[PDB]
């Protein structure tokens, strides 16, 4: 049986799986009246990929395929959804979206760019264009899973029927931000499909973990942040290294790579994400060069020392 | 000794070590006739950074510090920027590196956005203001001294910049002409010379060229089909890091296979420095499925004859 492993990358060297950032900190918080179902960032300890999650750090909630037309001088375009490559998607496959999608309600700031399949007489490469844009996944036009979404741009029609790509920056604003909540894969009154399940501490005295980042806003008073169970690296790692896991829960500790001193205990759940003994929203007040250690297999039951 | 490996992910699993976006394609081309010394993406196999390479795949190419005003007087659309470490402290300037890490490392106009989020929380609000804007860090602008602790950004928008803490968010260039990919910018400004360079990579071995992870890069505007290559993928830096396998010979073979058939399509030479090579002449794309890995097979001399491609 190949032993479980885990990155010894510490917390400032690894990536959101929610959003192409850097993580911030470790943070806490009781969410018994909240549906904690993200979408992205979903690995399971064996390797095995869940909901929209896929590997590649910059494609997360990025978007591509081709505009196909206008959704008034209102400077909304019809954009298709496509694999990385262009190819179109197989939307029969049990997932919710194509990989990558936003899985939050909110408006997805970012950059729309576009590179010609033609090139013209006279040239010898195709033209260009890239203007800011957002994806609003609020909209009833937000339709990944049948293949298209809306995307905006502010004051220019400088938009082709063309190839294009979203890079993600960011929120337009923060107030209809909700990182919790699912947008409509398939649109109004339509349910979800392939979902990666609801994740939350089943013994007593326990939170769940965050890896917390900032997110960018275009506008607007507010301190954004997106939380993810696990690091972008983690995934990669898990995924590659297909482990068996040995029961369901892996006791990690956080340990400052120069000293070897251990700064707290927690719980890495085969499904993929950590809960801690500590109740309230909180900072974890640990510096940034540290990394979670596994230590042993456990039983679910197993007492961590709190926090 | 420990043993050496290579991730086994996929060409289309990875991420340029030079801007952060997918890697798309390998690719080789001659390089005599030119000085092949990036800054981004450079890591032995021992897992030693060096030039400017960090391991936060979307830093790389990010900028971050605060706005402190107009850059000169006569131009309302030019900011000086400083530059610090991304938690907001100052960098130590004596270290023997060439700037502060993922900082550009090519001759352009890298194109992004600009985003603040205010170190202050006005009267009757809770959390601070914000904005973001649409911006241009030229590295062979004159007022690009980033080992210097400052740069100059440029924005479309010429009134909505706050002296404020301020992250640049690379996603590409503004135009094709003035991007050369293998012309380091001077990190301290003009008539000044790089400190603690990479060194420059090349094939030693008759009939070899480089092989490069090759990525497109966006374009603002332009006629143009812009592309920016690296040495080894981000996520091979953040192994070797980890790993710190000791490197037994200059040369590792390496072998391009499917994972689902074990076909093997080609072979390479992972030289101990950080860049790989293969049997190859000409400018052109490699013609292989992405869906393959490099696997690591031996360790062998510095003149191994590879299987001509």
Same mark, same amino acid.
């Given at each position: ?17 929610? %959003? ?33 999650? /896929? ?41 919710? =979206? ?10 997805? #700031? ?9 090139? +013209? ?20 036009? %937000?339709?990944?899973?049948? *293949? ?30 909700? /990182?919790?909540?699912?947008?409509? !894969? ?9 979902? =990666?399940?609801?994740? %939350?501490?089943?013994?007593?005295? +326990? ?22 169970? &696990? ?7 898990? !995924? /590659? ?7 369901? &829960?892996?006791?990690?500790? #956080?340990?400052?790579?120069?000293? *070897? ?9 085969? /499904? ?18 540290? !990394? %979670? ?8 039951? !197993? ?5």
């Amino acid at each position: 049986t190949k032993p479980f492993t885990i990155p010894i990358l510490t917390i400032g060297e690894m990536t959101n799986s929610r %959003f192409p950032v850097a993580i911030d900190m470790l943070y806490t918080s009781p969410t018994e009246n909240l549906v904690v179902q993200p979408q992205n960032g979903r690995c399971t300890l064996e390797g095995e990929l869940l909901g929209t999650t /896929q590997l590649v750090t910059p494609n997360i909630c990025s978007l591509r395929g081709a505009i196909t037309g206008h959704e008034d001088d209102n400077h909304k375009w019809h954009m298709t959804v496509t694999n990385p490559n262009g190819s179109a998607f197989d939307p029969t496959e049990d997932v919710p =979206a194509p990989l990558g999608t936003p899985d939050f309600i909110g408006d997805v #700031y970012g950059v729309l760019s576009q590179r010609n399949r033609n090139i +013209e007489s006279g040239q010898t490469a195709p033209a260009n264009r890239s203007h800011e844009a957002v994806i609003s996944t609020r909209s009833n036009k %937000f339709t990944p899973k049948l *293949g298209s979404v809306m995307i905006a741009t502010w004051n220019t029609n400088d938009v082709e029927n063309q190839p294009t790509k979203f890079t993600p920056v960011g929120l337009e604003n923060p107030g209809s931000f909700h /990182q919790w909540e699912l947008p409509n !894969y398939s649109g109004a009154l339509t349910l979800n499909m392939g979902l =990666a399940p609801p994740v %939350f501490p089943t013994y007593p005295g +326990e939170q769940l973990l965050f890896f917390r980042s900032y997110i960018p806003l275009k506008g607007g008073f507010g301190n954004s942040i997106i939380d993810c169970l &696990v690091p972008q690296e983690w995934i990669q790692h898990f !995924y /590659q290294e297909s482990a068996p896991s040995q029961t369901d &829960v892996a006791l990690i500790r #956080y340990v400052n790579p120069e000293t *070897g001193r251990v700064l707290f205990e927690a719980k890495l759940h085969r /499904q993929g994400f950590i809960t801690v003994a500590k109740t309230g929203d909180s900072p974890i007040n640990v510096p940034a060069n540290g !990394y %979670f250690r596994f230590d042993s297999w456990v039983n679910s039951f !197993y007492s961590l020392a709190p926090m």
